[PDB]
Symmetry: C3
Subunit: 112 residues, 3 copies
């Protein structure tokens, strides 16, 4: 397992931490949503939650990443939920497929 | 009408407030985007706006929730915009389909 | 080029800054993701990043906007990544297709 702290930012201005799949995977439209492994695990920095989003270049190549919420205290593996939209998409190991964005977790009075 | 304050968080670490449809609905891919009723209404806590996102397990079962922005001062019913991606999806009353995430509303000088 | 500061908010409570395409474009499902030009350019306010999301009415009409992250220091043109989901979608110049939401850029110790 590797923690979120091992992720790298592409540029100091980059909002997202880059996520790659640990496996080579081929996706076709008829397969529907697939969960790609990243080898990266929660949990997140105190008072933050995580949002998995696609990268634009990848989206433009026909791979849709479904927005995923990562809870602050999730300790499992961060997976990228993805689907080939129109064509056959091939994800090579180490292609940066998605990005993790950290956001403030707002405290509310909602019953747990 | 029920307010956002009646929503529950699944776990103290959960970023999102769970949203269910008030109706049993069946969705097929050819139907395209559908707005599912929740019976939950804005408005939101001061200085926040809302983001509707899917839950991972639901997404993986073939129900896409389209990211929806809920304005701070929206007083209508919060609906979940959803589409079956590949197969026939059946949403039973009370299945938690989506989640509402609260985010800080940043003030800017943009003209209203 | 027009800066983000020229965008307007629909209502004081509106979380998002409205985005239109500068061109009339027709989209069919088989075209897959398309990048629509807005004529609006980064960069963003200090300590913020941007999220491009769809508007609900547009989504309901069959135009999917893929969530896009705009980095704080991006100085290029903000484009909307879009796809017609089921039917032929026609985007007239000046239709407000998407919205830009500004979010806090959280500082982390991740290696750049
Ligand atoms: O794209 C996603 C979405 C969720 N999760 C993990 C982190 C979440 O905290 C956990 C539970 O997600 P839900 O089923 O409640 O959405 O699943 C992911 O790894 N990737
Ligand atoms: O998934 C969504 C998106 C929007 N709205 C409501 C709240 C928004 O403030 C309002 C207007 O949305 P737009 O058409 O401007 O996106 O619609 C929803 O109920 N669900
Ligand atoms: O919907 C989008 C997503 C991205 N970008 C621009 C701003 C980003 O900073 C830049 C790089 O995006 P990525 O390829 O790294 O996601 O592209 C857009 O104009 N629209």
């Amino acid at each position: 397992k590797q923690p979120i702290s091992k992720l790298t930012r592409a540029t100091p201005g980059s909002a997202g931490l880059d996520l790659c799949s640990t496996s080579h995977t081929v996706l076709t439209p008829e397969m529907g949503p697939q969960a790609l492994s990243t080898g990266i695990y929660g949990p997140l920095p105190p008072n933050t939650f995580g949002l998995i989003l696609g990268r634009s270049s990848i989206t433009m190549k026909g791979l849709q990443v479904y927005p995923g919420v990562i809870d602050n205290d999730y300790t499992g593996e961060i997976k990228i939920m993805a689907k080939a939209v129109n064509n056959i998409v091939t994800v090579s190991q180490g292609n940066r497929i998605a990005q993790l964005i950290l956001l403030p977790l707002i405290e509310t009075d909602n019953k747990v």
